[PDB]
Amino acid sequence: DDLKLPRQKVELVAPPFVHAHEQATKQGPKIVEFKLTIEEKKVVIDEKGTTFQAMTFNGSMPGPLMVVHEGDYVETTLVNPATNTMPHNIDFHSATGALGGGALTLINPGEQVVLRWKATKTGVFVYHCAPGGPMIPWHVVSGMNGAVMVLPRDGLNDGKGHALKYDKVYYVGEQDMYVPRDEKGNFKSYDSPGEAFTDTEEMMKKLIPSHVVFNGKVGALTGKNALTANVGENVLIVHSQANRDSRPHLIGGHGDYVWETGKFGNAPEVGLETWFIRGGSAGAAMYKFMQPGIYAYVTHNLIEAADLGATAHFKVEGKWNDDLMTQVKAPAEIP
Template sequence: MTQTTANRRRFMQVIGATGAVAVAGCLGNDADASENSTESEDEEGLPAAKAVDADRIARDPTDIPGPVDWNEPREHDITLETERVTAEIEPGVTFEYMTFGGQVPGPMVRVRQGDTVNLTFDVPDDMNIDMHNVDFHAVYGPGGGADATTLAPGDDPTQISFTAEYAGAFIYHCAVPNMDQHISSGMFGSILVEPEDGLPEVDHEFYLGQHEIYTDGEVGEEGHHGFDFDAMKKEEPTYVVFNGQAYGFTEDGVGPMEANTGETARVYFANGGPNLLSSLHPIGNVWSNYYRDGDLLSEPDKNIETAPIAPGTTAAGEMEFPVPGPVKIVDHALSRVVHKGALAVVDVAGEENPDVYDGDP
């Protein structure tokens, strides 16, 4: 796939065929020439794509523990295992990810305020080449647990125990000295500490994590992409993706998320970063209830169109679905959508509702 072909395909995904026809002339030959000249500058090219360790790096957005249904504090025994994984950012483009549990983001941890978490942290020698640890933003303690969990590959697993003292949606991430590289490579996830009274019931819950990937190749350039430290220092990512994969939850990826008209959904959204703010927007919808910065105790904000989420933050937003059709979840820094991969789709099925929306009156 050439870079030009990849960019035009992404452009069609984002705005749809009708919009593409209307503005295709604005791209013109100049855009094509620019893209092709960028590609031709890389005379040596990338090494061939590597064999992958996993069919997909993107964690299933429905892979979420069930809502809290207990009323007294309890203990949770949780194991986090780190794993280096070679997988595709997009077809034909491989990259070596660093992960908690083999996918991006790491598994969601879900507890109730006042619960105790007994964490076992492991860095197996056969799955890692780097030192790792974990910093939970939901933990009172040195480094959010990072000080006590720092391990080299092959070290004996370590254990910590903590009480979830404060409610909210929080991020966790690797926090070794070169944490920016590790987070960019996939080492982040979310811990949800539900308030004692729980959260309002919804029909669907989805779990997404945004991060930047800095590589030594161009977007769409087939082959194996290495990590580019200079690009990271300049905060110039090759890709900005959800759950480790460019356009993963679209028809061209593993498929969209699904819902029906009349239902509600809550999206837990972790911005791993490590550097860029996300401007989270559902195209064709709003966040009817928005839990800014993971605050689950205050009254949620209402009908928010675009929500800024700082790196190192988990937020939550709810949507209603009165009409069918695709709802496109994007970072509204739109070059990241059109060119870099920051797009996921919720495919809403059901009967048309012309009282709310009529596309052909």
């Protein structure tokens, strides 16, 4: 191997969490090594018990977030165990050449492959499976998509000469799902992805999802699994959608600094209510919390958010600010 740089192995963590990393760094370029192991599996996606033939990187929807810096090289070992039923590959939107890597990574069950790409573009980017032809959309909407973040070596900035630093980062992957129904309107179950294919493709081509979820299921980022923050903390929220548009919004908050197209060579917009994630992309928003309590993080098609699955919660700790908002008079009879 001609490339004589130091190598470092990083262990991935399951979304919505993100592996430990530096923002600004004094390190120089290195080869950062990752492993992804594909898993086909049947999962429950809603409160009613609907099942779904999922196909995943590393067992999760979305796949895990990789974090590197500009000028690093990213060397991924992609594994397709013999217990899976079909061929898979990987396309990095961050990479240059060979259909994002897809033309160099097609592997049958029982095989693995090693792909390296140079991180020449900064931002958040989708990665997804793309075997060929009609298999491309089917693998993606079955769950085979995640993201990678390529940070500047000096960290993030506001476009006006000031550093932005986040106290924590979360990754919200949004998935449009297509579960067929029978003639009485009930959702269908299947014993393998291959058995689900014909009915699923027929539904896909009509363009209307049955479910729109964060982190793989209705309610995944609520209750015991709500996102957390403190008043005064700056939180970065990375949002991806590999196939279909979304319009994120933080109920009771704002996007203080937003890269809706997701690329750090562009200055952020400021003070947004709602932003726009193009299908086939990742974007990012940073917010400094000012008030404690519950927030909902939604797509602002509210039918999708409340009725099809696309709501997360934040539970924020701290002291209420009565200057920013206050209930002057509680509910009372009309005089």
